[PDB]
Amino acid sequence: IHDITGKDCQDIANKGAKQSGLYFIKPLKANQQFLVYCEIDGSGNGWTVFQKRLDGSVDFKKNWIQYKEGFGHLSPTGTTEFWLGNEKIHLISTQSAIPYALRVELEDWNGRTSTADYAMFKVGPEADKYRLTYAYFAGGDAGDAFDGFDFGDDPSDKFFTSHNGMQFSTWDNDNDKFEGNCAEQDGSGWWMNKCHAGHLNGVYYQGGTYSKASTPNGYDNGIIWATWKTRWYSMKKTTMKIIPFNRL
């Protein structure tokens, strides 16, 4: 664990930290400091990482309190899977009205990486079920899965697969826009609508390709991002990370 601290990884980078790894941060309203993985590039950009997938080592079918508090493992090398915790993500992303951007970074099973950036990304309080909001899609070759996707199953698909303004759901805390239970069916915790076009907390399928026959329910429950790959393609790695917007 590194010595420099601050309110986020950008604050840490601004204080002269140059190495990616584990740091304590203490956002404005945090009761106490907590550990994060900071990705610090050569340009002085310090990203605060709140989600990582890369090998299937952690089960992301976790309950409300587990998603709240965080699970998985932090590593100095950034080679482990984790969810930082909705409370922590809330505290970072809302502090001092600092405008954060979210970057989603995806890696396929062929060595290709793509990104999607969201401006003015915020996660609300537990009182509002950790609602996700953003101002706009700011670009990236992964495409804008949070806008929803035209799957073809029906003309309401896009409205029903968009993620802006969605509350967070777990199997034991259903806050989705479906009569059924998206989180329970797809085995994740996520900002579910009816149900999703982007789903980075989904089931880890080795090799990317899976199909309906692979799933117990018949729905796409993999690590999907529909604007980049078919719903039957599950990413090899994902990163969700935030930085003050001006660093874009």
Binding site: F151, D153, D154, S156, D157, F160, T161, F178, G180, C182, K194, C195, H196, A197, Y219, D220, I224, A226, R231
Partner: peptide, 4 residues
């Protein structure tokens, strides 16, 4: 994905 979506739902019926």
């Amino acid at each position: 994905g979506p739902r019926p």
